Ligand SMILES: CCCCCCCCCCCCCC(=O)SCCNC(=O)CCNC(=O)[C@H](O)C(C)(C)COP(=O)(O)OP(=O)(O)OC[C@H]1O[C@@H](n2cnc3c(N)ncnc32)[C@H](O)[C@@H]1OP(=O)(O)O
Ligand SMILES: Cc1nn(C)c(C)c1NS(=O)(=O)c1c(Cl)cc(-c2ccnc(N3CCNCC3)c2)cc1Cl
Ligand SMILES: [Cl-]
Ligand SMILES: [Cl-]
Ligand SMILES: [Cl-]
């Protein structure tokens with residue numbers, strides 16, 4: 001296999017075993033001041049997401065042209081407020097919300113973003129960016145527009161003095177630093193079967209299936225309650241200590257913890273365990289991301305909850321996640337998704353998650369290190 005674009009990049013070769021931790025290439029000390037050229041009739045436009053009209057155009061581009069499953073049944077449907085949460089965390093920069101418009105119509109047809117993140121990779125901590133929401137309009141696909149978007153965001157990140165990035169993708173590219181698998185816990189099995197998310201699996205009836213996936217009506221962990229403002233510091237402390245066991249993690253300031261965890265309805269939920277002493281000892285979190293269901297006369301949207309960061313010090317992990325399922329169910333979710341990273345393997349089978357189709361590969365740009373098992377990945381991106 002060759003990669004006409006990826007082969008020119010500072011990433012390791014697929015198939016080479018890596019034994020040397022460090023940058024692929026030295027930092028560039030002068031950077032190109034001019035944007036890379038797009039094809040004729042298209043232009044750059046940095047997108048002001050504080051503008052309601054412009055945020056809606058981005059919502060529409062992603063709603064119509066972002067990630068689908070291999071059979072074109074489901075497409076992510078990130079909401080405008082969720083996009084604002086994802087794309088404006090602390091340290092966000094306007095030039096890192098990189099759009100492509102058609103010159104004549106103004107139509108938004110491409111996007112890529114970067115947000116700043118401190119990343120701990122093995123024994124190094126490095127200021128990086130996280131690249132997300134790369135999207136080319138379906139009518140514009142396969143015209144090598146994706147490499148221009150990647151090069152242009154790279155140049156704009158370089159201008160800010162940053163030379164490493166982290167990203168995930170569904171496809172295998174040079175070269176995954178780790179490979180995760182999605183698993184799903186049914187919460188409304190009837191809808192999931194009706195919309196062909198899952199199959200009636202041999203040999204159980206529908207009635208057996210609903211019974212199998214039935215959950216308690218309220219969580220069982222004593223003192224579980226939503227996170228509040230007073231909890232920001234101890235959620236920050238617990239998260240920092242907990243992550244030290246993994247090899248790829250974020251290093252978040254207290255302000256980033258407030259942004260990523262403080263509850264926002266229909267975007268992010270976090271529940272803490274406040275014990276009999278008033279001490280918060282654990283927390284669970286999950287974010288809300290629906291997917292459009294296409295070509296179906298009755299069901300239009302599948303409501304999914306996604307496991308975020310789950311920190312146990314005193315409640316067993318297995319119990320926290322069981323309460324996470326119960327809460328997702330009570331909130332009206334159809335499915336709970338989680339990856340096999342961190343210590344998630346310890347609960348996935350027990351709590352009746354089924355394996356799904358498709359990997360999520362983790363990558364670093366301009367950094368070589370050995371790859372790691374999923375159990376060592378402790379970074380979750382939206
Ligand atoms: C210092 C800072 C550095 C900053 C940069 C860090 C790097 C970040 C890299 C990006 C991190 C993104 C993280 C996310 O957001 S992952 C989510 C990706 N987005 C979607 O899946 C939405 C649906 N698909 C699309 O919108 C288009 O198919 C996209 C835009 C994905 C490709 O558009 P198109 O289909 O019109 O293709 P093309 O003709 O323009 O180009 C074909 C070339 O592009 C390579 N390709 C295909 N898919 C991906 C992919 N997901 N990551 C990286 N490369 C990908 C492909 O191998 C080929 O290269 P090569 O095989 O010839 O070599
Ligand atoms: C319900 C549903 N809706 N759609 C849209 C799909 C594909 C499913 N089935 S899934 O649940 O099992 C699932 C899910 Cl959620 C996601 C991915 C995946 C693939 C490629 N890229 C990403 N990114 C997400 C994180 N950062 C940007 C890249 C995710 C694959 C699968 Cl297969
Ligand atoms: Cl190319
Ligand atoms: Cl099911
Ligand atoms: Cl390796």
Ligand SMILES: [Mg+2]
Pocket residue numbers: 136140141142143144145146
């Ligand atoms: Mg293209």
